Every structure is written in C-alpha cells, then in structure tokens.
Amino acid sequence: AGKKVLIVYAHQEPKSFNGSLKNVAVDELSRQGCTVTVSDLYAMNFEPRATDKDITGTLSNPEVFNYGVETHEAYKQRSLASDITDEQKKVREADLVIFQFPLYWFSVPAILKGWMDRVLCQGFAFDIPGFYDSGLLQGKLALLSVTTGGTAEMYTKTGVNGDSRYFLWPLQHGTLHFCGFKVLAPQISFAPEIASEEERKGMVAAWSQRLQTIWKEEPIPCTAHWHFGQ
Amino acid sequence: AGKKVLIVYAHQEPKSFNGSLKNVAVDELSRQGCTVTVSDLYAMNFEPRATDKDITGTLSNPEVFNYGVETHEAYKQRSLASDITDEQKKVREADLVIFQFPLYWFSVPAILKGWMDRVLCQGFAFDIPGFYDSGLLQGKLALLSVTTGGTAEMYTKTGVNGDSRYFLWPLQHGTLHFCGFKVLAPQISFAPEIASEEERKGMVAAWSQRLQTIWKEEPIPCTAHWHFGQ
Numbered sequence: 001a002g003k004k005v006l007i008v009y010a011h012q013e014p015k016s017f018n019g020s021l022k023n024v025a026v027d028e029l030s031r032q033g034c035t036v037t038v039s040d041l042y043a044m045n046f047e048p049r050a051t052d053k054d055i056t057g058t059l060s061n062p063e064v065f066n067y068g069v070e071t072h073e074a075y076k077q078r079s080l081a082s083d084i085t086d087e088q089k090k091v092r093e094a095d096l097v098i099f100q101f102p103l104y105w106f107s108v109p110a111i112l113k114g115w116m117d118r119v120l121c122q123g124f125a126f127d128i129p130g131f132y133d134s135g136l137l138q139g140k141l142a143l144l145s146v147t148t149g150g151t152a153e154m155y156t157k158t159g160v161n162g163d164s165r166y167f168l169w170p171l172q173h174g175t176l177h178f179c180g181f182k183v184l185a186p187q188i189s190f191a192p193e194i195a196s197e198e199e200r201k202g203m204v205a206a207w208s209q210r211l212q213t214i215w216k217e218e219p220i221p222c223t224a225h226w227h228f229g230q
Numbered sequence: 231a232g233k234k235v236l237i238v239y240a241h242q243e244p245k246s247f248n249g250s251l252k253n254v255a256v257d258e259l260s261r262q263g264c265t266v267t268v269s270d271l272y273a274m275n276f277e278p279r280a281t282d283k284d285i286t287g288t289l290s291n292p293e294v295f296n297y298g299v300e301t302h303e304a305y306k307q308r309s310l311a312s313d314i315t316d317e318q319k320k321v322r323e324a325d326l327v328i329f330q331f332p333l334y335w336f337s338v339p340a341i342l343k344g345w346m347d348r349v350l351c352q353g354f355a356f357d358i359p360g361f362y363d364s365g366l367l368q369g370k371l372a373l374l375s376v377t378t379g380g381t382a383e384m385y386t387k388t389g390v391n392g393d394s395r396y397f398l399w400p401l402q403h404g405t406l407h408f409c410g411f412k413v414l415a416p417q418i419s420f421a422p423e424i425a426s427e428e429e430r431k432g433m434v435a436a437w438s439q440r441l442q443t444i445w446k447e448e449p450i451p452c453t454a455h456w457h458f459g460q
C-alpha cells in the first residue's frame with residue numbers, strides 16, 4: 001500500500017457520466033486507503049494555450065520564440081508559470097495518473113490537450129536522453145478512461161470509425177509511453193448517451209470493479225503491434 | 231477557377247519555420263489569384279475551451295450541461311458565441327482549408343484542437359445522419375501541413391514513432407473526413423530544428439512548389455488501409 005493517484009478530469013458537468021466515473025474512482029481509491037488528488041481542469045479554468053506567458057522573467061532567445069526550447073530552459077531555471085508547476089508537482093508525487101474524459105474528435109478535449117502540452121515539458125517529462133522506456137516519468141502508471149459517442153460496433157477494424165486502438169496511439173504511445181509511463185489498459189465506456197440506465201450502471205460498475213484490483217494489473221505492451229496488429 | 235482558401239495557423243512566433251510555411255502559402259496562393267484568409271489562432275487569443283460560455287441563449291437542459299447537445303441546439307437557434315460563427319463563416323466560404331501547425335504529442339496544439347472542438351459543431355459540420363462521406367462540409371478540401379521534432383526515419387513502420395500516417399488518423403479520419411472533407415495528401419516537414427539552413431530552405435521551397443499545382447491534386451482515400459496498410 002501507500003499509493004498516490006492523480007485523476008486529471010475534463011468534463012464541464014459534475015452530474016455527467018464522466019463526472020460519475022471520476023467520483024467512483026475517488027470513492028473507491030479513497031476507500032482503499034490511497035492518496036487521491038483530482039485536477040478538475042474546467043473548474044480550474046485551466047489554460048490550454050502554449051504561450052510565452054508560461055515563462056516568468058527573462059527568455060533564453062527573445063528574438064525568435066520557440067515554446068519547447070523556452071519551457072525546457074524555464075524548467076531548468078525554475079521559472080515556469082505556477083499553474084504548470086502545480087500540476088508537475090501532482091504528477092511527480094503520483095504513482096498512477098488516471099485521465100477521465102469524453103472523446104472529442106478521436107482525442108482529448110482541448111483543455112486536457114493543453115494540460116499535456118504545457119505540463120509535460122522537456123526536462124520534466126522527457127529529455128535527450130530519456131524517452132519511450134527511459135522517459136522521465138518511468139516507474140509511473142497511466143490510464144485513459146474515455147467515454148464515446150460512437151458504439152463499440154462502430155469502433156472495430158472494419159467499422160466506420162476503425163478499431164478504438166487506432167485513436168489511442170497518439171495518446172498512449174506518442175504521449176504517455178514517450179514520457180516513460182507504463183500504460184494500463186484503457187477503460188472505454190462506449191456510448192453512454194445511447195445506452196439504457198441498466199447499461200450505464202453496468203459500465204459504472206465495471207469501472208468500480210476494475211479499480212478494486214488496479215494495483216494487480218500488468219501494463220499493456222505499448223507497441224505498434226498492440227495498436228494496429230492482428 | 232476562382233478559389234477561396236482558409237489557412238488555420240497555430241504558431242506563436244511569426245519568424246518560426248511554421249510562420250514561413252504559412253507565409254509562402256499566402257504568397258503563392260495570392261499570386262495565383264486565390265482568395266486567402268488566415269485564422270492566426272494565437273494572435274487572436276482563440277478560446278480553446280468547450281464551455282457553457284459558447285452558448286448565449288436559453289439552454290435545452292440548464293440542470294445538466296451537455297456541451298455537444300447545447301451547441302447543436304445553439305447552432306440551430308443562432309445563439310453560439312460569435313468567435314465560433316466567425317470561424318464557421320470562413321469555413322463555409324472556403325474551397326480548401328489548410329491547417330498549419332507543429333506536431334504537439336502526435337496531434338495538433340491545444341489551441342487548434344480547441345478550434346476543431348468548438349467550430350465543428352453538430353448542425354454545422356455534420357448531422358445524424360450526415361457524416362463521413364455524408365458530412366456537411368462535403369465538396370470541400372482539407373490539408374494538414376505539419377512540422378515535427380522527430381525525423382522521417384523515426385516516423386516509419388519500423389521506427390520508434392511508427393509510420394507518420396498512423397498519427398494522422400484522428401485528424402484526417404476522425405475529424406475532417408467525419409465532417410465530409412475530402413483530404414489532400416499531408417505535407418509533413420520533418421525535423422526542421424535539427425536540419426541545416428539549406429535543408430530548411432528546401433523544405434519551404436518544396437511546399438511552395440507543391441502549392442503551384444495544388445488545384446490539380448486528387449484527395450486520398452481516407453481509409454484504414456491508407457493509414458495502416460494491410
């Protein structure tokens with residue numbers, strides 16, 4: 001025991017299906033004795049834009065602004081904006097980061113994309129060297145808990161949306177694996193708006209039940225083969 | 231042959247490599263006699279967050295906020311925030327929409343993701359039914375012009391990032407095709423930061439060169455096969 005969890009949560013409405021999945025996670029992980037922290041991005045009015053306001057004081061090359069370089073240097077010189085370093089501290093302390101969001105355009109809502117863009121800066125999340133298996137958050141687990149509009153059927157290899165694994169690639173491989181996370185299998189709650197009450201409650205219960213043994217889980221092999229292969 | 235082009239541009243720095251690609255696109259399309267509009271998202275401080283501020287009228291369900299439902303209804307009633315309908319006018323009038331951006335976590339920067347989330351609402355960009363080949367922006371072309379940190383070699387089937395086409399899927403298929411766009415082949419300018427000044431000039435010149443004959447190109451088959459192979 002002694003585990004710390006950060007839930008990064010991206011829904012506008014507390015009473016939403018996403019809201020419920022977030023609350024079940026808080027309740028169940030809290031019941032287990034885990035340390036639990038929630039970043040409620042919409043409630044925090046979290047800034048999604050990557051701008052020169054993210055660096056306090058003097059820039060490293062004020063003639064030509066390169067956000068990635070400047071935030072690298074700012075991390076090294078401890079001059080990042082405080083909303084960013086507040087989140088970095090939650091991530092640093094976490095053993096597990098759960099992302100709770102509705103799927104927006106086969107990806108995360110923009111407010112959560114901005115969290116990924118602004119929080120996972122060079123020197124904090126990865127470096128040269130130290131990416132993919134050697135990324136700087138190695139030792140930590142990440143989990144995507146996604147809800148969709150489209151049905152499970154639509155999310156098959158030959159269905160109109162293709163396999164759900166296809167849209168996970170930029171998130172699980174390009175982002176989280178790159179930064180060194182080992183990736184737990186995603187939690188995909190398909191089409192709750194279309195689903196009946198019974199089906200919805202079933203999906204909530206599947207999540208709660210998964211959470212009972214989350215610390216027993218093996219990570220997926222975050223590979224092209226897993227995402228695209230037979 | 232009287233074509234209208236919208237460039238949706240997501241970089242903070244006019245002197246950046248993205249800025250140059252944006253500017254040569256303006257130069258070359260303007261030279262051709264095309265009508266050209268640029269949505270400079272950072273300069274406009276474009277709002278990326280999907281919030282209830284995006285609806286100014288009476289909500290369909292004020293007790294439980296569902297962004298997608300409320301913006302659909304707001305679109306029909308014409309009570310969307312005006313920054314959204316301003317962009318929708320640009321899209322409505324465009325024959326070709328070029329997206330110019332650096333790759334952030336195998337995707338678009340959050341400020342551009344916010345543009346996609348907020349501008350492409352139900353009723354404007356698609357209906358149910360009325361999506362993929364039946365999407366409401368049918369007849370229009372779209373083109374992703376992407377710059378990367380990683381090398382072309384890293385973005386191959388056997389490289390650590392997997393093939394470049396893999397990360398295009400959520401954008402080309404899940405977003406643009408869903409809304410009815412036909413998709414022109416992507417322009418990917420690999421690893422300019424790492425490249426020599428001469429390799430950089432060459433990549434800019436190649437884009438400019440391609441643009442001379444852009445109106446003669448056919449779209450890709452925006453399918454799982456095109457993105458992922460057999």
Ligand SMILES: Cc1cc2nc3c(=O)[nH]c(=O)nc-3n(C[C@H](O)[C@H](O)[C@H](O)COP(=O)(O)OP(=O)(O)OC[C@H]3O[C@@H](n4cnc5c(N)ncnc54)[C@H](O)[C@@H]3O)c2cc1C
Nearest residue numbers: 016017018020102103104105106147148149150193200298
């Ligand atoms: C801009 C945008 C882009 C999108 N792009 C995509 C896309 O690319 N692909 C895709 O598939 N979808 C897409 N969607 C749809 C989106 O993913 C879904 O609308 C979203 O996942 C629904 O999740 P929710 O939490 O908002 O559902 P909700 O509407 O909040 O929940 C569904 C119902 O469940 C009820 N409920 C809440 N809690 C419980 C509970 N504890 N037990 C039982 N019932 C409960 C709620 O009251 C609600 O009535 C997009 C939507 C938007 C707005």
Ligand SMILES: Cc1cc2nc3c(=O)[nH]c(=O)nc-3n(C[C@H](O)[C@H](O)[C@H](O)COP(=O)(O)OP(=O)(O)OC[C@H]3O[C@@H](n4cnc5c(N)ncnc54)[C@H](O)[C@@H]3O)c2cc1C
Nearest residue numbers: 068246247248250332333334335336377378379380423430
């Ligand atoms: C949050 C974040 C996430 C990222 N995630 C990824 C990822 O998942 N995968 C990945 O591969 N990369 C990733 N990157 C890297 C990113 O894609 C690159 O940093 C970006 O593409 C570089 O493009 P730029 O326009 O900013 O380059 P610049 O720094 O602006 O360009 C490089 C050089 O070109 C020069 N230049 C400008 N105009 C010209 C011209 N006309 N001729 C010649 N030289 C010129 C500039 O002066 C500069 O010196 C990420 C970066 C950030 C910040």
Ligand SMILES: CC[n+]1c(-c2ccccc2)c2cc(N)ccc2c2ccc(N)cc21
Nearest residue numbers: 067068069071072120121122335379380423
């Ligand atoms: C701009 C630095 N830089 C590069 C990068 C660009 C060119 C060469 C080496 C690394 C980068 C490359 C990849 N693949 C993924 C993420 C990042 C990144 C992420 C955040 C940041 N703050 C700077 C970042």
Ligand SMILES: CC[n+]1c(-c2ccccc2)c2cc(N)ccc2c2ccc(N)cc21
Nearest residue numbers: 149150193297298299301302350351352358
């Ligand atoms: C919430 C409506 N809704 C749904 C949707 C959700 C559930 C059932 C049917 C459609 C949707 C589904 C997919 N695949 C892709 C985009 C959207 C979307 C996009 C914008 C918006 N403003 C509402 C949207």
Ligand SMILES: CC[n+]1c(-c2ccccc2)c2cc(N)ccc2c2ccc(N)cc21
Nearest residue numbers: 127128131378379380381383384421423424
């Ligand atoms: C291995 C690719 N790669 C990266 C790199 C780019 C993005 C992410 C990780 C590494 C690189 C990054 C920096 N800063 C400087 C030089 C190089 C480089 C130099 C030569 C080469 N042959 C590959 C190179």
Ligand SMILES: [Zn+2]
Nearest residue numbers: 173177222223
């Ligand atoms: Zn991986």
Ligand SMILES: [Zn+2]
Nearest residue numbers: 403407452453
């Ligand atoms: Zn497609």
